[PDB]
Amino acid sequence: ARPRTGRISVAIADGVASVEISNLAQRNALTKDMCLEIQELMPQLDADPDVAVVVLRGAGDTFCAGASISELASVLLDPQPDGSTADHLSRADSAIAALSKPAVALVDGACMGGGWQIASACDFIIANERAVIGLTPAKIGIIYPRPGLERLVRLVGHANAKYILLTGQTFSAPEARALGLVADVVPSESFEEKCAALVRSLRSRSRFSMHSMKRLVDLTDSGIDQEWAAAWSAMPDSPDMGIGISAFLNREQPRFMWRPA
Amino acid sequence: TGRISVAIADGVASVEISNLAQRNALTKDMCLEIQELMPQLDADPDVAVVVLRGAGDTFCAGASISELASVLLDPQPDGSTADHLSRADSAIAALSKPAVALVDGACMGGGWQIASACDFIIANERAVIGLTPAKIGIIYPRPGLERLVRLVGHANAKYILLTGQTFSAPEARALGLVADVVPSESFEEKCAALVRSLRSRSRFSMHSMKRLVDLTDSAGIDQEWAAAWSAMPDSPDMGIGISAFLNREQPRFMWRPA
Amino acid sequence: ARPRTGRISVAIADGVASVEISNLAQRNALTKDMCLEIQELMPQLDADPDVAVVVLRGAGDTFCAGASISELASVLLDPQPDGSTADHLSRADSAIAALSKPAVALVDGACMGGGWQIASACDFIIANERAVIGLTPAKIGIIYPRPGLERLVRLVGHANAKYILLTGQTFSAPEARALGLVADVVPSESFEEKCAALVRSLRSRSRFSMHSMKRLVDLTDSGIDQEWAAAWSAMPDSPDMGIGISAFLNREQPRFMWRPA
Ligand SMILES: C[As](C)(=O)[O-]
Numbered sequence: 001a002r003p004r005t006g007r008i009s010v011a012i013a014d015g016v017a018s019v020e021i022s023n024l025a026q027r028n029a030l031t032k033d034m035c036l037e038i039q040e041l042m043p044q045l046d047a048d049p050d051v052a053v054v055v056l057r058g059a060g061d062t063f064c065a066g067a068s069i070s071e072l073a074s075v076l077l078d079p080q081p082d083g084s085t086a087d088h089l090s091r092a093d094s095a096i097a098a099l100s101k102p103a104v105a106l107v108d109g110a111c112m113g114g115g116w117q118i119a120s121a122c123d124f125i126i127a128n129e130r131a132v133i134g135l136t137p138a139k140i141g142i143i144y145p146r147p148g149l150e151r152l153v154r155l156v157g158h159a160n161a162k163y164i165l166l167t168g169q170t171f172s173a174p175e176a177r178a179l180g181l182v183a184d185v186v187p188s189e190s191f192e193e194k195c196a197a198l199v200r201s202l203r204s205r206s207r208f209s210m211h212s213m214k215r216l217v218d219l220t221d222s223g224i225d226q227e228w229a230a231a232w233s234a235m236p237d238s239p240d241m242g243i244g245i246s247a248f249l250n251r252e253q254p255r256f257m258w259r260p261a
Numbered sequence: 262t263g264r265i266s267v268a269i270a271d272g273v274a275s276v277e278i279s280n281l282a283q284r285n286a287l288t289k290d291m292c293l294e295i296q297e298l299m300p301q302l303d304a305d306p307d308v309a310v311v312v313l314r315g316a317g318d319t320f321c322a323g324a325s326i327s328e329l330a331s332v333l334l335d336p337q338p339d340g341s342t343a344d345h346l347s348r349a350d351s352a353i354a355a356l357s358k359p360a361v362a363l364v365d366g367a368c369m370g371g372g373w374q375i376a377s378a379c380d381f382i383i384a385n386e387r388a389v390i391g392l393t394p395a396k397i398g399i400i401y402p403r404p405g406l407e408r409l410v411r412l413v414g415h416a417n418a419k420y421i422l423l424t425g426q427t428f429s430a431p432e433a434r435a436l437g438l439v440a441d442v443v444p445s446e447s448f449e450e451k452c453a454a455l456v457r458s459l460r461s462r463s464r465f466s467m468h469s470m471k472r473l474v475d476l477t478d479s480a481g482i483d484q485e486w487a488a489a490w491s492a493m494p495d496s497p498d499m500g501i502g503i504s505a506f507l508n509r510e511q512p513r514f515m516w517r518p519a
Numbered sequence: 520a521r522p523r524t525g526r527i528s529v530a531i532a533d534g535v536a537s538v539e540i541s542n543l544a545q546r547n548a549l550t551k552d553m554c555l556e557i558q559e560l561m562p563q564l565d566a567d568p569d570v571a572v573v574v575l576r577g578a579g580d581t582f583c584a585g586a587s588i589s590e591l592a593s594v595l596l597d598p599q600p601d602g603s604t605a606d607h608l609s610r611a612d613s614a615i616a617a618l619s620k621p622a623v624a625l626v627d628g629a630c631m632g633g634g635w636q637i638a639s640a641c642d643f644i645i646a647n648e649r650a651v652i653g654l655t656p657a658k659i660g661i662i663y664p665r666p667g668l669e670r671l672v673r674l675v676g677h678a679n680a681k682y683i684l685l686t687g688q689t690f691s692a693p694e695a696r697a698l699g700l701v702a703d704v705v706p707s708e709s710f711e712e713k714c715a716a717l718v719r720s721l722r723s724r725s726r727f728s729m730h731s732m733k734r735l736v737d738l739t740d741s742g743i744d745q746e747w748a749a750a751w752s753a754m755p756d757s758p759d760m761g762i763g764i765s766a767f768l769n770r771e772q773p774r775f776m777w778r779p780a
Pocket residue numbers: 084085086087088090091
C-alpha cells in the first residue's frame with residue numbers, strides 16, 4: 001500500500017482562509033510539492049477579496065514535522081537551470097511572510113524542524129498546551145535556513161537561539177512560550193473555542209490598522225520614513241478612523257469598512 | 262479638569278495622571294503639561310527619582326477619544342501636525358534620572374506608550390493592559406510601535422497590535438510589556454520598597470547606565486563610554502561602595518548630577 | 520592561616536572540557552589571575568582536538584560572586600605601562616565568547632555582578648532552580664562593563680536591562696528566566712541528571728551544524744553574506760548531512776563525523 005499524497009489545501013468561509021498542511025502519513029512533513037503549493041497559494045490569497053485573514057494549521061492533531069527527510073535535498077538544495085539551488089522551504093516561508101493580510105499559525109501536536117520556520121512566517125503562533133516544538137537541524141547535520149535562523153535570533157535573542165539550535169531539544173508549549181517561540185498557549189480543553197474567538201476578533205478589527213501595522217512592524221529595523229509618512233497620512237483618509245471614533249463614543253462595536261486595493 | 266500633578270518628597274517626584282472621569286485618559290493639555298514638567302524635574306536638584314502613576318486605582322486609558330485628533334493630529338501653522346502624546350513620551354524618555362511607571366487598573370491604548378517611556382514598568386497583578394489602535398481604526402504612533410517591537414519582538418508585537426486584546430498583568434509580563442508583577446495585597450508596600458532601593462543605589466551608576474543603555478544600538482557611543490568609564494574611579498561612589506561592602510554595611514553614596 | 524588560591528581548572532573527558540571556577544573562600548569570586556587564566560585557556564581549548572564541548576561551572580554549589588571586591592581595581596582598571604588600563608574580566612569574557620566550540624554555563628547558587636557576564640559569554644545558561652542572579656554595579660558605584668552591558672541589553676531588552684541594572688536586585692532563577700537572563704531552569708533534585716543529559720546531547724549532535732550555527736547566530740546583527748554562502752555550500756560537502764538523513768530513515772541515532780580543521 002502506497003501512502004496518500006501530501007498536500008496543502010485551503011478552505012474559505014466568512015473572510016477566513018484556512019490553510020491546512022496535510023500529510024498525515026509523515027506527520028504533516030513538507031514535501032517539495034507542498035512547498036511549491038504554499039508558494040503559489042499565498043499570493044492568490046493576498047489578491048482574493050473574499051479573504052481577510054489567513055489561518056495556518058495542520059491536518060488532524062499535529063502541525064508539521066518539517067521538511068520531509070526522505071526528500072530533504074530536493075526541498076533545501078533543489079538544482080536550478082542557472083546553476084544555483086533553491087531552498088523551497090524558505091521560499092514558502094517568504095511567500096507566507098509577504099502576505100499583507102493577517103496570518104496566524106495554530107499549532108497542535110508536533111511542530112518540528114522547518115515546521116517552526118513555516119509557523120513563524122505567520123504574524124504569530126498560538127499553541128495548544130499539549131503541543132511540542134523542536135528545531136532539529138543539528139540532529140540531522142544541516143543548518144537552519146537563513147531567514148528562519150535570523151527570525152529566531154530576533155524573536156528569542158542570541159542565547160535562547162543557541163540553546164534551541166545547538167541542543168535540538170524538544171520543548172513543551174509552555175517552555176516554548178517562555179523562550180519566545182510562540183505568542184500564546186491555550187489549554188487543550190479550550191483550544192478550539194479560543195482560537196475561533198481569536199479569529200473572530202481579527203475579523204472585527206480595522207483592516208486599515210492591521211495592514212498598516214503589520215507592514216510597519218515588519219519594516220522596523222529592516223525609506224522606512226516614507227512608509228511611515230504615507231501610512232500616517234492615509235490614516236485620517238481611510239474611513240475606519242471616523243467609524244472607530246464614533247462607535248467608541250456611542251459604546252458600540254464598530255462596523256469597519258476599509259479594504260485592501 | 263484633567264491634569265498632571267506632582268508631589269516631591271525625599272528625592273522622589275511622584276507624578277500623577279489625574280483625569281478620573283475619563284479613567285485617566287490623556288487630553289492634549291495633559292500631554293503639554295508632561296512635556297513641560299519633565300525637563301523641570303530633570304533640572305530640579307531636589308529630585309533624584311521619578312515615579313509615574315495614575316490617580317485612584319487606574320493608570321491611563323490612552324489618548325482621550327473625544328479629542329483624539331487634537332492629541333495625535335493637532336494641526337500646526339506651518340501645515341504639519343503634531344502628535345502631543347509622542348512629544349510627551351519623548352519628554353519622559355529624555356529624563357536623565359531614573360523613572361518607573363507603577364501601573365494599576367487599566368493601561369489602554371497610548372497609556373502603554375507613556376508608561377514604557379519610563380525606564381521600566383511594575384504592574385499590580387490585577388492590572389490590565391491592551392494596545393487598541395486596531396479597535397479604533399488608527400495606527401500606534403511610531404515611537405511607541407518601535408519601542409514595542411524592540412521590547413517584545415516582532416511576533417508578540419503583532420499579536421498585541423493586530424488583536425488589540427486586553428491582557429492581564431501576568432500575561433503582559435510573559436509578553437515582555439512590563440518588567441514585573443506584584444500581587445495586589447503587597448503592591449503598595451513592594452513599590453515603596455522598590456523606590457527606597459532606587460534612592461539608595463549609586464546615582465553615578467544609575468545616571469551612567471541609564472544613558473549607556475539608551476544609547477545602545479542608536480564613535481558617538483565610544484566617546485560616551487570612554488568619558489563614563491574614566492569618570493567612574495574619579496566619582497566618590499566607587500570608593501564608598503567598595504569600602505561599604507568590605508565592612509559589611511550599606512553604602513551611603515554621594516555623587517550628584519550637575 | 521592563608522586562603523587557598525583561587526584558580527580556573529579544566530578537566531577533559533569524552534570530548535567535554537569542564538572548566539571550573541574555583542575560589543570557594545570568596546564564593547568563587549574572580550581574581551585578576553583567574554581572569555588571566557580564562558583568557559589563556561580558551562584558545563587552547565579551541566585548538567585542542569580532544570575537546571568538542573566546553574562546560575563552565577563553579578566549584579561546589581555556587582557559580583561566581585563576580586570580580587573580587589577586595590581586588591576590584593586590579594580586575595577592572597588594571598594599570599598598564601602605556602598609562603591605559605585593562606579590564607581583565609572583559610578580556611576573559613571575550614576569550615570565552617570567541618570559542619568556536621559550543622559552551623554552556625551551569626549556574627548553581629549565586630551568580631553575582633560580573634558572574635553573569637562570564638556566564639553569558641557562553642552560548643547559554645542553564646540554572647538550578649535554587650540559584651540566584653543579580654547584576655550589582657549600582658550597589659558598588661561602578662558601571663557594568665560594556666560587553667556585558669550590551670549583551671544584556673540585547674538579551675533582555677532595554678526596559679528589563681534597566682530594571683535589572685538600576686535596582687541591582689537579586690532574582691531567583693525562575694525570575695531570571697522570565698527576564699531572559701538564563702535559558703532554562705531545572706529543579707534542584709534533577710539538576711545533575713539533566714545537565715549531564717544536556718551535555719550528552721550536545722556531544723551527539725552534528726558538530727558541523729553546531730559550529731556553523733553558533734558562528735552564524737553570533738554574526739546576526741554584528742561580510743555576513745559571504746559566511747552564509749560558504750557555510751551553505753559546505754553543508755552538503757560535510758559528511759554529517761548524509762549520515763543524519765540515513766540515520767533518521769533507518770530509525771537510529773546518527774554517528775556524526777565532521778570535525779573542525
Ligand atoms: C535563497 As533561494 C536560491 O532558495 O531563493
